[PDB]
Amino acid sequence: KEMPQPKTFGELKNLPLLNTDKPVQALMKIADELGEIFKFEAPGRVTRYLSSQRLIKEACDESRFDKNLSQALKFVRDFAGDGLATSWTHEKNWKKAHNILLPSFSQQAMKGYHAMMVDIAVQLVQKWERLNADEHIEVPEDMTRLTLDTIGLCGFNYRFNSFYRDQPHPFITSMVRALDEAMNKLQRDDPAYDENKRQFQEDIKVMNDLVDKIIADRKASGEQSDDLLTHMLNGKDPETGEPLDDENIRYQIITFLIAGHETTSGLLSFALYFLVKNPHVLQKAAEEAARVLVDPVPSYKQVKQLKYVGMVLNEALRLWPTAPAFSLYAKEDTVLGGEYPLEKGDELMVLIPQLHRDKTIWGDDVEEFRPERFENPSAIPQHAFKPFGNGQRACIGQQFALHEATLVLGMMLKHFDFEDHTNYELDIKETLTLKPEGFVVKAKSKKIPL
Amino acid sequence: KEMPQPKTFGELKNLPLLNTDKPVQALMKIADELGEIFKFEAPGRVTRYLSSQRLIKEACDESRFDKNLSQALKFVRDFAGDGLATSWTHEKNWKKAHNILLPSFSQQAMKGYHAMMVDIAVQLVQKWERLNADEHIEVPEDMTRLTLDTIGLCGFNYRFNSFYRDQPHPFITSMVRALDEAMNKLQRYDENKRQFQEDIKVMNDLVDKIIADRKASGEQSDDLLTHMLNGKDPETGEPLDDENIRYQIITFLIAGHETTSGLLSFALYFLVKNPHVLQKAAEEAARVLVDPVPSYKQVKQLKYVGMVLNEALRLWPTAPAFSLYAKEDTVLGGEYPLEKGDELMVLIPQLHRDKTIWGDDVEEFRPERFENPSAIPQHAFKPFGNGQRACIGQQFALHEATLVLGMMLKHFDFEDHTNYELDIKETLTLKPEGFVVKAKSKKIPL
Numbered sequence: 015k016e017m018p019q020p021k022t023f024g025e026l027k028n029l030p031l032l033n034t035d036k037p038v039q040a041l042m043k044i045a046d047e048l049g050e051i052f053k054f055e056a057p058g059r060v061t062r063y064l065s066s067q068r069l070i071k072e073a074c075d076e077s078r079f080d081k082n083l084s085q086a087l088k089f090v091r092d093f094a095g096d097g098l099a100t101s102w103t104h105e106k107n108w109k110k111a112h113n114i115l116l117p118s119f120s121q122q123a124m125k126g127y128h129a130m131m132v133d134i135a136v137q138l139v140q141k142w143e144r145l146n147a148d149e150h151i152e153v154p155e156d157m158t159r160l161t162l163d164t165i166g167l168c169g170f171n172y173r174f175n176s177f178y179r180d181q182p183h184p185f186i187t188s189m190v191r192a193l194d195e196a197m198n199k200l201q202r203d204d205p206a207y208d209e210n211k212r213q214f215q216e217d218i219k220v221m222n223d224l225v226d227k228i229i230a231d232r233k234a235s236g237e238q239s240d241d242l243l244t245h246m247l248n249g250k251d252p253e254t255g256e257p258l259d260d261e262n263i264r265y266q267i268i269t270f271l272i273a274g275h276e277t278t279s280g281l282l283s284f285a286l287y288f289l290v291k292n293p294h295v296l297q298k299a300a301e302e303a304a305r306v307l308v309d310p311v312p313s314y315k316q317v318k319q320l321k322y323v324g325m326v327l328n329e330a331l332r333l334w335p336t337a338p339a340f341s342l343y344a345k346e347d348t349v350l351g352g353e354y355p356l357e358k359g360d361e362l363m364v365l366i367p368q369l370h371r372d373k374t375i376w377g378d379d380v381e382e383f384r385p386e387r388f389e390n391p392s393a394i395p396q397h398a399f400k401p402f403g404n405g406q407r408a409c410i411g412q413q414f415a416l417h418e419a420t421l422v423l424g425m426m427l428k429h430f431d432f433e434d435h436t437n438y439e440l441d442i443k444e445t446l447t448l449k450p451e452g453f454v455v456k457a458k459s460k461k462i463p464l
Numbered sequence: 465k466e467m468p469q470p471k472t473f474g475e476l477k478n479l480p481l482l483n484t485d486k487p488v489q490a491l492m493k494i495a496d497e498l499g500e501i502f503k504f505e506a507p508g509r510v511t512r513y514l515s516s517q518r519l520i521k522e523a524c525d526e527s528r529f530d531k532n533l534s535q536a537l538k539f540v541r542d543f544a545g546d547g548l549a550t551s552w553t554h555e556k557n558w559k560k561a562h563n564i565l566l567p568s569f570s571q572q573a574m575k576g577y578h579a580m581m582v583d584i585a586v587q588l589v590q591k592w593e594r595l596n597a598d599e600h601i602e603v604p605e606d607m608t609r610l611t612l613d614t615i616g617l618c619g620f621n622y623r624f625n626s627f628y629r630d631q632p633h634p635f636i637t638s639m640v641r642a643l644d645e646a647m648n649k650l651q652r653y654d655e656n657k658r659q660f661q662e663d664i665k666v667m668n669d670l671v672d673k674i675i676a677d678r679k680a681s682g683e684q685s686d687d688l689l690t691h692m693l694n695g696k697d698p699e700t701g702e703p704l705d706d707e708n709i710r711y712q713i714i715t716f717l718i719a720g721h722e723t724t725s726g727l728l729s730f731a732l733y734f735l736v737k738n739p740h741v742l743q744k745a746a747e748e749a750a751r752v753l754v755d756p757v758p759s760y761k762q763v764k765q766l767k768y769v770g771m772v773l774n775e776a777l778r779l780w781p782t783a784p785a786f787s788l789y790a791k792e793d794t795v796l797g798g799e800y801p802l803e804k805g806d807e808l809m810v811l812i813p814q815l816h817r818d819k820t821i822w823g824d825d826v827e828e829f830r831p832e833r834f835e836n837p838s839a840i841p842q843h844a845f846k847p848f849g850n851g852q853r854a855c856i857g858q859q860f861a862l863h864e865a866t867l868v869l870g871m872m873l874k875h876f877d878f879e880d881h882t883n884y885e886l887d888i889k890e891t892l893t894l895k896p897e898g899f900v901v902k903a904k905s906k907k908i909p910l
């Protein structure tokens with residue numbers, strides 16, 4: 015009945031606990047100490063962090079709980095607008111954009127994006143083929159180059175050309191700096207932050223200007239590509255009969271870049287980390303890649319046949335889900351788990367890394383990397399594995415992310431042997447997402463042509 | 465390109481090769497002679513037996529192959545109906561029952577079945593504790609008593625009371641005789657037909673009566689029957705009807721009892737033939753089972769016992785084959801073209817003897833092979849089938865077998881007093897016929 019709570023700081027209550035550069039990992043340690051639920055209080059804010067499948071499966075009851083905009087999402091909304099990820103379910107533009115965009119993100123829709131994904135994947139492979147002896151790979155950096163260029167190409171047929179640059183495209187610099195300012199605001203307004211504010215508005219203008227120009231350029235030409243922008247310029251919501259307006263389309267494009275690039279590149283980086291730390295898994299995954307990817311360019315159907323590669327990605331998502339939490343609110347008065355009464359509007363946070371370590375679901379070996387857990391998807395209980403959120407507010411880009419990640423990891427395993435030449439010590443950097451900072455490897459080419 | 469084929473008998477093609485009392489072992493000997501794939505022809509039937517991990521890993525591609533009802537499963541369907549094991553993947557009742565029954569067969573669901581499993585396991589231990597000096601144990605007979613009573617209790621709260629009987633419960637007599645008739649038809653009668661129909665009515669009547677009794681009672685138990693009476697398929701929103709529920713309960717008894725008792729019998733056989741392995745498993749049992757009654761969590765900690773069971777399943781998988789058909793035209797192993805509908809048989813005991821996977825010591829019993837599942841190549845170990853048509857009772861069988869074997873190793877030392885010579889009887893399943901041991905109690909109370 016009584017709910018545990020971490021240590022407090024006088025008037026600031028629990029808020030200073032978030033004044034750390036690894037807040038998700040700090041919250042995981044608190045969940046280890048306090049259990050399946052703990053209260054987190056701040057000035058004018060109260061929330062509850064859930065860690066057990068028992069309680070999270072109730073929180074995922076859409077008849078009782080809806081998606082809440084966390085403080086992080088509220089700050090991101092200042093440039094993501096009423097895009098899909100930062101809009102309330104009851105806002106007209108959520109259901110409208112959801113209905114219009116759901117078919118463009120289906121598994122069948124990945125057939126149309128496949129060629130553009132291969133374009134960037136081949137650039138990644140060619141970069142590593144052209145490395146000199148004893149040179150190494152900066153894994154999260156190159157994975158971020160890939161995912162960002164892939165969403166740029168599939169999103170609105172724009173080439174950031176990250177593999178031609180040391181310093182990223184100005185749009186990316188502003189987006190990254192905008193996300194940093196939004197996240198820094200959480201653990202933070204005195205007059206000294208006036209420089210942060212002016213820079214924040216400058217970065218927002220950079221993002222809007224480029225995206226608005228591309229939309230305007232596309233409308234003035236009438237050209238039709240295989241990208242999401244063409245789909246949004248021609249799509250109509252069956253319910254309202256309306257299309258997305260130019261402003262919301264911009265917010266959707268910004269959202270795809272934010273919500274998609276860093277989560278997906280982290281997944282690829284974590285997957286390669288776990289593969290080089292578990293050579294038996296790497297051998298098993300590389301064997302499948304060699305057997306399935308028999309052509310110089312992988313086909314869509316071949317990517318679907320990379321079952322074990324997909325198992326590797328799911329197990330990487332189990333241990334380190336790169337979008338590590340989502341927020342919910344109680345639609346009405348209700349009782350959670352038969353002992354925690356909640357009032358209408360009360361907030362809940364789902365700590366996904368803790369859910370994925372619930373020993374009552376996964377057994378005692380929760381910390382071991384074993385893709386064989388996902389050998390048969392039916393053995394996974396309901397709401398035990400939630401790397402892509404829940405219900406109608408689940409990740410719309412799930413099939414996009416998993417197809418890109420399966421394609422790229424498969425090509426990496428086909429074309430190179432990998433060496434953990436530094437015996438890299440896992441150090442997880444936290445931004446809006448999670449990534450293994452400083453993860454480096456050496457790649458020895460198998461000399462297989464593209 | 466050209467596919468090997470065993471010796472033929474004129475118009476009957478390969479069919480007389482199955483007119484033997486050990487057909488699986490005969491097929492293993494053919495695979496030893498002909499290799500990883502051979503064609504098997506009969507009047508109006510063509511199938512292909514696969515034995516190598518190289519080809520079977522392709523056959524397990526669910527985008528290219530689906531479960532086929534072998535001739536044996538088709539005959540079992542005459543009393544198992546459209547239960548999970550004898551239904552086609554495209555039948556509405558398969559996916560419906562699959563969605564409904566999957567949560568009640570999960571690892572988490574074993575926590576709720578554990579107490580009933582302990583109930584029967586304690587009866588087995590007490591039977592052996594009460595044997596007189598120089599009396600011996602008939603191993604497959606007692607293991608079948610245990611597994612059959614365990615599924616009766618966990619399945620629908622029914623006590624066959626096999627440890628109170630010499631002659632089995634009348635339902636079991638009809639079930640065994642029905643399975644015998646189905647298998648004899650493969651290698652094959654008005655008396656057989658009338659008897660076959662008599663046994664089907666016996667099985668249906670008892671199961672249907674228990675269902676009606678449960679519905680007429682309204683009581684809620686921790687058994688599979690309760691889950692099926694209240695469960696709804698999330699997809700269609702529909703529950704299983706009473707007739708299909710009958711086929712499911714009949715299926716659990718058929719598909720579960722003899723496969724699991726065979727696993728226990730083969731496991732004990734291999735342990736008494738390998739005293740160093742037996743000592744290792746017995747040491748683990750004593751260290752883990754520190755309470756008079758094993759807990760669910762303690763069974764999960766019997767790691768080496770579980771490896772013993774997996775290695776027993778490697779050498780003698782008690783469900784020794786399954787059948788597949790090609791969903792479309794496809795090429796197997798880059799040299800064997802197959803047309804849509806072409807049938808494949810997976811010879812599991814031969815797959816598990818692939819030296820390219822397990823090394824040269826394939827015939828040696830070494831549970832250490834299973835220390836790391838990640839070191840085992842894909843689709844090399846398939847004692848429970850494949851994919852969405854894999855054994856739904858896998859966690860049930862392994863939990864029961866780990867619990868019972870663990871208690872056996874804790875409470876008794878075992879003697880191979882006859883120096884038993886392995887003789888594998890073939891029914892729907894495999895078992896070591898005539899396997900007997902002596903048990904000397906360690907005098908540890910329950």
Ligand code: HEM
Pocket residue numbers: 081098099100112165269270273274275277278281335336337339340341400401402403404406407408409410411412414415
């Ligand atoms: C491994 C990669 C990814 C992970 C782990 C991930 C995770 C998530 C999670 C947990 C949510 C729900 C957040 C909440 O409830 O507040 C979400 C929502 C969303 N994601 Fe992803 N995501 C990934 C990749 C992508 C990609 C590639 C795209 C776009 C191309 C994308 C676009 C979105 C959108 C638009 C939403 C909001 C959906 C809605 O509310 O209608 N994500 N994602």
Ligand code: HEM
Pocket residue numbers: 531548549550562615715716719720721723724727781782783785786787846847848849850852853854855856857858860861
């Ligand atoms: C060591 C013991 C067992 C072994 C070796 C075993 C083996 C198998 C195999 C190989 C299959 C696939 C057959 C095919 O593909 O045609 C299968 C399916 C099945 N088994 Fe088991 N089994 C065992 C125990 C059990 C138990 C205890 C139960 C029930 C409590 C059970 C119920 C089933 C069912 C319902 C199916 C069909 C699943 C479906 O297609 O939806 N089995 N089993």
